[PDB]
Amino acid sequence: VNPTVFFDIAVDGEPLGRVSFELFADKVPKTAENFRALSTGEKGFGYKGSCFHRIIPGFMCQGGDFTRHNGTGGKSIYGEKFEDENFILKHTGPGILSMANAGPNTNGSQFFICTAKTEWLDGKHVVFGKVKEGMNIVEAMERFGSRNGKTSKKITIADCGQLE
């Protein structure tokens, strides 16, 4: 019953591959629904065409800033930044999907995909999903990041949506 969504990733406009995610709606429904709706575009805005603006090899890939494309923007489907739903799920290794934020109760649309175990984030960022298929595509994305997070090629969500 947990929704599945996909990203089709491109690198300087060239197709790279598809990453799919299981969203833990059974455990974090508000946070999963936000990401699901942004991935279908059904509210009139969302992740299609946006980029991964910060990628640190061995750490995480961060994206979801579809309004300012650099980490300063993005917005939820709720008309305002929303609360940390819970911290039930932990950052237990590669593939974990977790919300970026600006401190307690400031969730918008930015998210990151862990490429390692990042337990120091537990209790600070809401974990709400995990890569289901295509972890190898995230690993190929990671190689275009750098120590300070700047990417050497433009990584983009060329398409996205909900699978069934």
UniProtKB/Swiss-Prot annotation:
There is a cross-link at K27 (Glycyl lysine isopeptide (Lys-Gly) (interchain with G-Cter in ubiquitin)). The keyword Isomerase applies. Changing H125A: Loss of peptidyl-prolyl cis-trans isomerase activity and interaction with HCV NS5A. Loss of ability to stimulate MAPK/ERK phosphorylation. The modification Phosphothreonine is found at T92. Changing R68A: No effect on peptidyl-prolyl cis-trans isomerase activity. Reduced interaction with BSG/CD147 and ability to induce leukocyte chemotaxis. Residues 6-162 form the PPIase cyclophilin-type domain. This is Peptidyl-prolyl cis-trans isomerase A. It comes from Homo sapiens (Human). The lineage of its organism: Eukaryota, Metazoa, Chordata, Craniata, Vertebrata.
